């Protein structure tokens, strides 16, 4: 079912997409795993840490 | 709201304290980012009362964490609101769903 | 034959695929300049095009933003962060103060606020808050000014200008106007030639800035940082 | 600013020591020389995090 | 450790298999140029001592 | 002001040899790293022209698997010193030199038929090492100008046959540049900690020094670039 969602976006069913990196202008060699992750902030901040 | 879910965010929220829930079904008078003005509908109504309900919304408070909890409104004047909805979102609230 | 003989490139075309979408066409190119040309320009664009921003905004009957005031569907935070996304084009000068005042309930939006000539709104359907009674209005005052890049607001206040008054409210600017950049590179037909090729470039912004504009300045700092390398001795 | 200079000049070469709680052998503390880096959080060379 | 194995790994066909190269200076201007995989199986002129 | 941006300084060059450089340059403005270290290296390797050996022909060799006695070094290795030779030609854009020798020990640049406008920058490069005295080398060996790099892959094909017998292809290194390696670091000035520092390490062959190499790739990228240029 994933597969096919995703195929209804026009996305690749591989779930993996080529990338270019912006430091260099250039291509990877292999695709990328390029998704959406829900973060969270874990209230360690550092500034009441150090 | 997070993209990926699994059904019950709406249990919690539902049953947590920080959200506002409309205790009887109606239509808002009112919308103010203070307080909500909820006039029940007539069959609803408890019979012999003013029939206008107020809800206050807690701003800005200190959370035990020392953490911000802070209420909003989540509708437009005159919508129609049922029993048991979802008014004012709370902390990490999402119109009536949980999002942290 | 003519090896150091290189085409210069040209703006071919411009097409307006909308005031925030834009999209440019460079030929003719060398072989693989393209790649470079678009890389170096990408970065410049995203680093280092000026921009006009919200930087302050003063409201009666408040003090701090974290206050409610009378009769605003919104919040004061809300409304700062809805701020932060209106994108103003000024003309002449480097600072400007814009007055909004609204009356009576309605959905105020970045359509009213008093206008002045060398000022505009891209987008008067930027809405900003609502009032709901009216009786109830809001007035306010914002300060636009002219940077570049985006200064958090403790880096500002670091001026410590002595003496702010309190019913002020800061708020944090991201100058650039862009916000997607991306090219492509094609092989065309030009002077009966292979090696070369065009850059398409496709540029989403606010549209507060001229693509071709834009296409100049970065150029120009760009020839200015080479020039200053071919200065070495 | 001379405040800033002056803390420049007197740690360009003065080892500090650090440690990891717990201590479990002797490569728990390590000398380093410190270079100044704006920030709150310590930064460290990945094999001696290793 | 897995970029070291990644590109000390070899494949059958690659891009500019079989040329046969100077020096690790060419090897590297050649790479950079994208003419040739890293894991082409080439002949080249190493130099060491003992 | 908006319009200005630090312009950094041309700090310091040392020169490993008369070959090997190190230019470091400093401040820079965010980003302005990367990105100058990718165009320069990107120019340089792919980009700067130059002439060098292209096609080769020996008398005695038919094939780079064929053989020829007399030296212990077979067809690649001698390929490969060809290669690695340094060779710079005014004004023509082409000319075909011829060697000869014949005697043991190391056949070096300066046996190679003299040509007054080609020059070669280290005749004390080996070419060949012969075994034999009885014995001699003889080969003729083109040089074209060209640009960057190009593999011999590229230019073999099909429609070629047109090289005769005995004729070898060899790589076109134009680009004089040896080794490029752009790096970035950290820099402070008057409490501006994102100001990067630029360090380059160049190596070239003896055709010209990395500093004109550097210069002459930054009037190149200039000058392609000027087309936008709306002032001075």
């Given at each position: 079912?994933?597969?096919?969602?995703?195929?209804?976006?026009?996305?690749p069913?591989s779930?993996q997409?080529?990338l270019?990196?912006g430091?260099?202008?250039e291509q990877?060699?292999?695709?990328?795993?390029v998704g959406?992750m829900?973060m969270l902030?874990?209230?360690?901040?550092?500034?009441?840490?150090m | 709201?997070?993209?990926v879910?699994?059904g019950?965010e709406?249990?919690?929220?539902?049953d947590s304290?920080?959200?506002?829930?409309?205790?009887?079904?109606?239509?808002?008078?009112?919308?103010?980012?203070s307080?909500?003005?909820?006039?029940?509908?007539?069959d609803?109504?408890?019979?012999?009362?003013?029939?206008?309900?107020?809800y206050?919304?807690?701003?800005?408070?200190?959370?035990?964490q020392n953490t911000?909890?802070?209420?909003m409104?989540?509708?437009?004047?005159?919508?129609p609101?049922?029993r048991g909805?979802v008014?004012?979102d709370?902390?990490?609230?999402?119109?009536?769903?949980?999002?942290? | 034959?003519?090896?150091?003989?290189?085409?210069?490139?040209?703006?071919?075309?411009?097409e307006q695929v909308?005031?925030?979408?834009?999209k440019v066409t460079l030929?003719?190119?060398?072989?693989?300049f393209?790649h470079?040309?678009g890389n170096?320009?990408?970065?410049?664009?995203?680093?280092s095009?000026?921009?006009?921003?919200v930087?302050?905004v003063?409201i009666?009957?408040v003090?701090?933003?974290?206050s409610?005031?009378?009769?605003?569907?919104?919040?004061?935070?809300?409304?700062?962060l809805?701020?932060?996304?209106?994108?103003?084009?000024?003309?002449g000068k480097?600072?400007?103060?814009?007055?909004?005042?609204?009356?009576?309930?309605?959905?105020?939006?970045?359509?009213?606020?008093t206008?002045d000539?060398?000022?505009?709104?891209?987008?008067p359907?930027?809405?900003?808050?609502?009032?709901?009674d009216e009786?109830?209005?809001?007035?306010?005052?914002?300060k636009?000014?002219?940077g570049?890049g985006?200064?958090?607001?403790?880096?500002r206040?670091?001026?410590?200008?002595?003496?702010?008054?309190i019913?002020?409210?800061?708020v944090?600017?991201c100058?650039?106007?862009?916000?997607?950049?991306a090219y492509?590179v094609?092989?065309?037909?030009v002077?009966?030639?292979?090696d070369?090729?065009?850059?398409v470039?496709?540029?989403?912004t606010?549209?507060?800035?001229?693509?071709?504009?834009?296409?100049?300045?970065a150029?120009?700092i760009?020839?200015?940082q080479?020039?200053?390398?071919?200065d070495?001795? | 600013?001379?405040?800033?200079d002056?803390?420049?000049?007197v740690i360009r070469?003065?080892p500090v020591l650090?440690?990891?709680a717990?201590?479990?052998?002797?490569?728990?503390?390590?000398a380093?020389?410190?270079?100044?880096?704006?920030?709150?959080?310590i930064?460290?060379?990945?094999?001696?995090?290793? | 450790?897995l970029?070291?194995?990644?590109?000390?790994?070899?494949?059958?066909n690659?891009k500019?298999e079989?040329?046969?190269?100077?020096?690790?200076?060419?090897?590297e201007?050649?790479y950079?140029s994208?003419?040739?995989?890293?894991?082409?199986?080439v002949?080249?002129?190493?130099?060491?001592?003992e």
């Amino acid at each position: 079912e994933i597969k096919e969602l995703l195929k209804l976006g026009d996305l690749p069913t591989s779930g993996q997409i080529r990338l270019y990196d912006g430091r260099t202008g250039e291509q990877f060699e292999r695709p990328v795993t390029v998704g959406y992750m829900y973060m969270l902030k874990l209230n360690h901040l550092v500034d009441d840490k150090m | 709201k997070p993209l990926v879910g699994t059904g019950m965010e709406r249990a919690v929220a539902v049953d947590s304290g920080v959200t506002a829930v409309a205790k009887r079904g109606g239509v808002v008078q009112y919308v103010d980012a203070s307080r909500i003005v909820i006039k029940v509908n007539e069959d609803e109504m408890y019979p012999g009362e003013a029939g206008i309900d107020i809800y206050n919304l807690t701003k800005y408070t200190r959370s035990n964490q020392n953490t911000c909890i802070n209420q909003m409104p989540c509708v437009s004047l005159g919508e129609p609101v049922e029993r048991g909805d979802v008014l004012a979102d709370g902390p990490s609230t999402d119109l009536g769903e949980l999002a942290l | 034959g003519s090896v150091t003989e290189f085409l210069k490139p040209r703006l071919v075309d411009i097409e307006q695929v909308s005031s925030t979408h834009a999209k440019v066409t460079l030929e003719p190119l060398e072989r693989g300049f393209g790649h470079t040309l678009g890389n170096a320009l990408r970065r410049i664009l995203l680093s280092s095009m000026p921009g006009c921003a919200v930087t302050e905004v003063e409201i009666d009957g408040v003090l701090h933003e974290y206050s409610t005031k009378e009769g605003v569907q919104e919040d004061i935070l809300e409304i700062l962060l809805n701020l932060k996304g209106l994108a103003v084009r000024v003309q002449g000068k480097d600072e400007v103060i814009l007055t909004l005042n609204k009356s009576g309930i309605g959905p105020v939006t970045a359509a009213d606020i008093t206008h002045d000539g060398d000022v505009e709104i891209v987008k008067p359907q930027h809405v900003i808050c609502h009032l709901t009674d009216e009786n109830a209005s809001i007035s306010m005052r914002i300060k636009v000014q002219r940077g570049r890049g985006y200064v958090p607001a403790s880096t500002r206040i670091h001026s410590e200008e002595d003496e702010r008054p309190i019913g002020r409210l800061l708020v944090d600017a991201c100058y650039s106007p862009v916000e997607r950049i991306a090219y492509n590179v094609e092989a065309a037909r030009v002077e009966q030639r292979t090696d070369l090729d065009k850059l398409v470039i496709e540029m989403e912004t606010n549209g507060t800035i001229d693509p071709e504009e834009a296409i100049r300045r970065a150029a120009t700092i760009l020839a200015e940082q080479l020039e200053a390398f071919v200065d070495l001795r | 600013a001379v405040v800033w200079d002056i803390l420049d000049e007197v740690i360009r070469e003065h080892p500090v020591l650090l440690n990891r709680a717990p201590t479990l052998h002797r490569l728990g503390i390590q000398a380093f020389e410190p270079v100044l880096i704006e920030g709150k959080a310590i930064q460290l060379h990945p094999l001696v995090c290793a | 450790v897995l970029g070291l194995y990644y590109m000390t790994r070899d494949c059958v066909n690659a891009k500019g298999e079989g040329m046969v190269l100077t020096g690790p200076k060419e090897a590297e201007r050649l790479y950079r140029s994208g003419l040739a995989s890293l894991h082409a199986r080439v002949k080249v002129r190493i130099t060491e001592y003992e």
